Write a protein that holds these residues in place. Sequence first.
Motif, PDB file in Angstrom:
ATOM      1  N   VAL A 125      -4.424   0.797   8.991  1.00 26.76           N
ATOM      2  CA  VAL A 125      -5.176   0.923   7.577  1.00 26.76           C
ATOM      3  C   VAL A 125      -6.938   0.934   8.164  1.00 26.76           C
ATOM      4  O   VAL A 125      -6.923   0.109   9.230  1.00 26.76           O
ATOM      5  N   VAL A 177      -1.166  -1.104  -4.189  1.00 27.98           N
ATOM      6  CA  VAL A 177      -2.855   0.023  -4.578  1.00 27.98           C
ATOM      7  C   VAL A 177      -2.020   1.112  -3.934  1.00 27.98           C
ATOM      8  O   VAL A 177      -1.027   1.277  -3.566  1.00 27.98           O
ATOM      9  N   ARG A 203       4.663   3.326   2.992  1.00 24.07           N
ATOM     10  CA  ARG A 203       4.401   1.497   2.135  1.00 24.07           C
ATOM     11  C   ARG A 203       3.969   1.298   3.500  1.00 24.07           C
ATOM     12  O   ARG A 203       4.455   1.399   4.495  1.00 24.07           O
ATOM     13  N   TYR A 263     -10.825  -3.067   0.973  1.00 24.35           N
ATOM     14  CA  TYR A 263      -9.861  -3.334  -0.119  1.00 24.35           C
ATOM     15  C   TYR A 263      -9.705  -4.847   0.616  1.00 24.35           C
ATOM     16  O   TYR A 263      -9.158  -5.565  -0.763  1.00 24.35           O
ATOM     17  N   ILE A 292       0.524  -1.087   0.025  1.00 19.86           N
ATOM     18  CA  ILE A 292      -0.083  -0.023   0.183  1.00 19.86           C
ATOM     19  C   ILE A 292       1.021   1.353  -0.253  1.00 19.86           C
ATOM     20  O   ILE A 292       2.092   1.980   0.931  1.00 19.86           O
ATOM     21  N   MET A 335     -10.406   0.981   3.020  1.00 24.28           N
ATOM     22  CA  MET A 335      -8.967  -0.220   3.063  1.00 24.28           C
ATOM     23  C   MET A 335      -8.981  -1.028   3.535  1.00 24.28           C
ATOM     24  O   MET A 335      -8.410  -2.152   2.446  1.00 24.28           O
ATOM     25  N   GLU A 352      -3.316   4.102  -1.222  1.00 22.08           N
ATOM     26  CA  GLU A 352      -4.068   4.964  -0.212  1.00 22.08           C
ATOM     27  C   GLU A 352      -3.697   6.366   0.336  1.00 22.08           C
ATOM     28  O   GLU A 352      -3.348   6.296   0.708  1.00 22.08           O
TER      29      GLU A 352
END
Lengths: 37, 262, 128, 224
Positions: free
Chosen positions: B211, B199, B172, B218, B116, B215, B201
């Motif tokens: 998170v 992805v 990340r 996701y 992410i 998400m 975000e």
Amino acid sequence: QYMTLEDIENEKFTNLEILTHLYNLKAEIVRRLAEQG
Amino acid sequence: DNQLSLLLKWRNDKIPLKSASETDNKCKVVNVKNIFKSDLSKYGANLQALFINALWKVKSRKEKEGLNINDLSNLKIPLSLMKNGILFIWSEKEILGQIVEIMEQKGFTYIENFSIMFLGLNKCLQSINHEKSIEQVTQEKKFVMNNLDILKSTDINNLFLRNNYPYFKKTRHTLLMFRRIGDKNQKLELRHQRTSDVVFEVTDEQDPSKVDTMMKEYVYQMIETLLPKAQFIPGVDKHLKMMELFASTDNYRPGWISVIEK
Amino acid sequence: QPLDFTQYAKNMRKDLSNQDICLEDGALNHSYFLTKKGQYWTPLNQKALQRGIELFGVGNWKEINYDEFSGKANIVELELRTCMILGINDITEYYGKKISEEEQEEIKKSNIAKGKKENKLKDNIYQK
Amino acid sequence: SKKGLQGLLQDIEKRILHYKQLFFKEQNEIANGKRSMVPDNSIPICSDVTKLNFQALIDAQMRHAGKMFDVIMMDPPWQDSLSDEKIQNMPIQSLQQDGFIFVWAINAKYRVTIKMIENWGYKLVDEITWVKKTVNGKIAKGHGFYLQHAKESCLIGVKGDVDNGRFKKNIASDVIFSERRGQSQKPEEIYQYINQLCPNGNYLEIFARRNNLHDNWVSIGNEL
Ligand SMILES: C[S@@+](CC[C@H](N)C(=O)[O-])C[C@H]1O[C@@H](n2cnc3c(N)ncnc32)[C@H](O)[C@@H]1O
């Protein structure tokens, strides 16, 4: 390569490689002319 | 120019799945003292997906409570709990390899990582214009999503959330996915290449590791897409084939076993 | 204590780099680094071509390839390099001339002078 | 064939003239000092790492700089393709005493790379992910088995004394959103990130093509 000019005219090939491709093609035309004669 | 109407497109498509009631047969909410020292084989069997929603106590996360990495070796994942399946772990950068090594000691071959990219919420807001509660954070996330046609002029490298870290700034988050092949001729059906390995975000700077909703949805949809027959549909499925550790105390996702550390 | 990175790189290229990668003083030979790998014309190859023109008639390239190049060379490249050496693009009139090393510079200068005189000097080659 | 064939003969004459001059021009530029795209302060090595005398490199680095390498980047030829054992047998223990290793790893060789960092005395402390970008700015999704691979992971391990004058802390980014520039061609930004980590230091690349030649870099490869 062969009679296909686009293959021997690739931008990825360097001038030495392109030039020896043309010379090999020249040898091929000479051989075809000799076969004709 | 940065194509963030396409990079962040999912934030306008995926809707949070409604939590199922505790008194419903589509969820299995189990409460344990310590998940790492609890026999999980009594709380599910023949699992296909095991998503450990692990929040780690790392030096990058300054003064923040979380799971200790050295306790992960105490976790028991027997063949009865999961025979042939996929395990999902939230990984931090300083305890990456250790996790992999731990996963090697329990028969879990590394197969994937899902990363992410984090876009700074404050950076995106400043690009639009020129402690924060989670309701406010969601509000400005939706505001950034609505105002994305005028944010496209800003370069993507100025929007990356470069958070503090000893060596390289943390922009990340990682979800390592491991597999347990187990027995032979027991094929785990997978619909391949249906979710991007990367992805993007928009996140808050304080706790990127935690998170937020929309998400985690996701990640849930990635897991449910990767393992189709693991989805619990009533009528011809006896047991739940998904199970998540350290789940939210209020959001019990249907088709999953909700393990709550209480 | 700063490190002179130019001198350090020069010394390391002198120590652990090929004779074609670096020059005699350690300077980076840029000639090797803009042709494809394995297609670089070394100064040893130029001396070999000169010695082959001295030893064998210019035009017969199989003998030069099998004698002064150990068989690992291109006949096309040999013809092009002898065109550079003689200074003339078409070496048909130089077929088997067998020109010495110490004499070839004279014909190179003559062809270059004819290139200036006839306005045919395009990139150091008499375009006849 | 027949008449147009010798027509092609005229053609195979004309091009072979024009290209000839082009080649001559390039070689003339070679004669009159034409700089290449590679920098002047680059140290290239054209040898196989199986057959390369690493002790010569170590002694040369000791006598020319007085210290071992600070960053050792690596893009191994995973299964020319070197085996895992031959890649591991490379003496990176002696090529570095206090610094970083920046070894790139495809997914199928992600775990063994973490092994190699562990087996070379390094401790794995970082990962830099290169997200491949299309020309328009989108995500260059590739092909995978579980997920659509659109990333390349460079695992960074560290060995020894880092709190010295070199090795600036808390720098650059762990994510490179750069475009795909070629087959297995790594982004340039990582080099900048390396210059953000270790300013004016000594760096090594073990499997380097001609595009990986940078300033103050001792690059190793077979097509260099
Ligand atoms: C994964 S690619 C590296 C690509 C390079 N890092 C780039 O970004 O262009 C592997 C490269 O390592 C080099 N190589 C392959 N086998 C080698 C060997 N045995 N010893 C040394 N270098 C080798 C070759 O140049 C090959 O293209």
